[PDB]
Design a protein around this ligand. Sequence first.
Ligand SMILES: [Ca+2]
Ligand SMILES: [Ca+2]
Lengths: 351, 69
Amino acid sequence: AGYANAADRESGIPAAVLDGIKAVAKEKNATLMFRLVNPHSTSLIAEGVATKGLGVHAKSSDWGLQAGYIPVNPNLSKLFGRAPEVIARADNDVNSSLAHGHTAVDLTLSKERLDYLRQAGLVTGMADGVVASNHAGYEQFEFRVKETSDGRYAVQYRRKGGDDFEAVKVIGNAAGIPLTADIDMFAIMPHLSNFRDSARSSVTSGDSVTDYLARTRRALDRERIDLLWKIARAGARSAVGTEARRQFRYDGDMNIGVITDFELEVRNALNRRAHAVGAQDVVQHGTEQNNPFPEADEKIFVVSATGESQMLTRGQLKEYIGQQRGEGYVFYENRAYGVAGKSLFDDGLGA
Amino acid sequence: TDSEEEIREAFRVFDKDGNGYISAAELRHVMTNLGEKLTDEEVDEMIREADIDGDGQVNYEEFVQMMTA
Ligand SMILES: [Ca+2]
Ligand SMILES: [Ca+2]
């Protein structure tokens, strides 16, 4: 479909990418929840700018022709009027990423991102060439663009009165593709039936309880009820990924964080639909439910297992989760919420 | 050996409605999602098995013992 409602459009997620997300939600029978995507990242993701991983600490920029990108020069990031300590740590964040596979690429914008920037007011006009902006940074720096033979525009800048323009360098892919923000998943609520096989592979060897017994037993039933509890335990444990979450998972040399097997599947299935459209991988790590520095980001974009989407305050989010749990969808919450007095649960909550 | 926060997360898969207890209805739901269509009698039997105190449901401490065998 591409965007069906106001929430879809407020999510910041590119329409084609969002279309795959809804398909994956239905195929894997799981509710997918996301933190909103910054609207300056939307177009970049859609035209194929790469997405950053957990290891990139450098700050993104929210202004100028570099909006949406992650500048090598921190003074070009959202950190523009900050103290010297700040820009100093940010400097290290940048060199750290470059030492670990990331590239420093010359920024060149597509014709379309250039139109978006101007239509959004990020760039208030130009010289055909010389750009203007009421952002405060345009008071310390000058920028201009130059069409390449590629049909793109190379971004150049200089410090007010430092006689020579130079390329705005931006952090990229180990393959040299510029990076923008990734899509942060807030939570993934899988239907419990997704774990029958997982459970049987653990307790049987993939067999139903009945077939396992027929095959290894002979001609109450205490053993049977005991195997049934064994499959219940195994399914619940795989549903919340008890063992998977004791370690970190990696994609090649990239730390993808703490993520359950099922959540990895989702990540992979979504990235897959993204390639199919013209995007790079868009989900680069696990869910906010395993983030040790949890945010209190007040609106969550939710796509149900049925494909319906909407935005929830988190008060509505508690009710939504309760309702979905009644339909057999599993939820486990960030382990720090209880202590922060921010639990999404209303049960006992302890041993 | 699972931690307390680990057992609580699992308990939460069974306790669908959200009171700190697992009833026979909830367990039956867990079981066919997990591929085991059971009779009301079989379910009752699974609960009696974990129902140490005899009320007719599985509370958290009973669940802990069940999860440990
Ligand atoms: Ca209950
Ligand atoms: Ca009991």
